[PDB]
Design a protein around this ligand. Structure first.
Ligand SMILES: CC(=O)NCCc1c[nH]c2ccc(F)cc12
Length: 119
């Protein structure tokens, strides 16, 4: 990550961009597994093996409350969603596939956000 991403405080304008990025991911056809916290009734061992769970609704709450101070912190929460999924599930599961697709989409949108900050 470059110096702007790590060190430039998030402004109000930056927060309008983060809201738009998050809404784009929530609207993606392959986002369904990640919209809300993992349901322990459907995976009874999940919370014993994933120590820091994350989901898009938790990220939306954090965005609304201005939790994030730097872009790197927002990217770290998003990345946790995908990394938790690829560690818990095998490489041939549909959950793993959704993580592959949605992370690629996130990177496309994140590059767009970074470009608009600087020009
Ligand atoms: C987002 C994520 O990684 N989900 C995995 C855990 C999970 C949720 N619902 C399920 C239903 C059946 C199953 F075998 C596992 C699960």
């Amino acid at each position: 990550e470059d110096a702007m991403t790590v060190l430039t405080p998030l402004t109000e304008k930056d927060y309008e961009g983060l809201k738009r990025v998050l809404r784009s991911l929530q609207a993606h056809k392959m986002a369904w597994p990640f919209l809300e916290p993992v349901d322990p009734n459907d995976a009874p061992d999940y919370y014993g093996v994933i120590k820091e769970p994350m989901d898009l609704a938790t990220m939306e709450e954090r965005v609304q409350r201005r939790y994030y101070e730097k872009l790197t912190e927002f990217v770290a929460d998003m990345t946790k969603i995908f990394d938790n999924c690829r560690y818990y599930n095998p490489s041939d599961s549909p959950f793993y596939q959704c993580a592959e697709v949605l992370e690629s989409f996130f990177v496309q949108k994140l590059k767009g956000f970074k470009a608009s900050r600087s020009h």
